[PDB]
Amino acid sequence: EPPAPQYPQRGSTGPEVLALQQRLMDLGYFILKADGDYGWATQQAVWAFQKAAGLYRDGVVGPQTQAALDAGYRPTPRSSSGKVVEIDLDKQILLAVEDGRVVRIINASSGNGETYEAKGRTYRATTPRGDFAVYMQRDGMHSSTLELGDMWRPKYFRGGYAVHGSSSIPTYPASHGCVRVSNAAMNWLWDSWGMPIGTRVLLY
Ligand SMILES: [Cl-]
Ligand SMILES: [Cl-]
Ligand SMILES: [Cl-]
Ligand SMILES: [Cl-]
Numbered sequence: 001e002p003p004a005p006q007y008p009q010r011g012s013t014g015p016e017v018l019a020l021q022q023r024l025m026d027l028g029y030f031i032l033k034a035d036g037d038y039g040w041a042t043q044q045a046v047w048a049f050q051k052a053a054g055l056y057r058d059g060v061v062g063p064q065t066q067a068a069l070d071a072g073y074r075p076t077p078r079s080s081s082g083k084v085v086e087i088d089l090d091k092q093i094l095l096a097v098e099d100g101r102v103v104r105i106i107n108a109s110s111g112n113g114e115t116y117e118a119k120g121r122t123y124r125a126t127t128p129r130g131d132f133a134v135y136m137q138r139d140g141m142h143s144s145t146l147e148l149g150d151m152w153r154p155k156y157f158r159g160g161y162a163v164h165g166s167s168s169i170p171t172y173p174a175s176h177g178c179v180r181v182s183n184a185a186m187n188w189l190w191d192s193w194g195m196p197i198g199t200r201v202l203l204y
Pocket of ligand 1: 010011038
């Protein structure tokens, strides 16, 4: 009649959640607080972890996810030098990379690949693959020609294609093509890490 273990998941609280949050933090998955409550922010970090590790993206830290946590799984970046934002489209993560070392792994969501209509024309919600650079930024909440909602602190890398904060960053590609991250992650990129004009943005 004793209860089985807790698998940390959204809504959980307790020491095991605290330990998970700290381990994520230690491994570089973006999370600000280890407080023992598995809320929205923790969800973003768990999803980033499961994505990175190639695991089913359910937010539930069961036996397989725990094994990967214990193994200390971190993705290997493609770049070798300098500051680079890498976006892994298959895994749906953004990597803040410096000198070939991942500094942070951030949950992301990119284009859904479906058609959409805008100012009377049909487009396809593809995120481009390639080697680009931040060329402009708008430091507040702004509208998009591509995206339907507003974008928080966009950093533009090819025409209207930007990395930005969003209210929803799901476990599948959900956008019209821009790359969404949490507002907190976007603030970190801007204000703590620094991602100035000219920063390489590599998508693959
Ligand atoms: Cl919650
Ligand atoms: Cl949280
Ligand atoms: Cl999945
Ligand atoms: Cl699992």
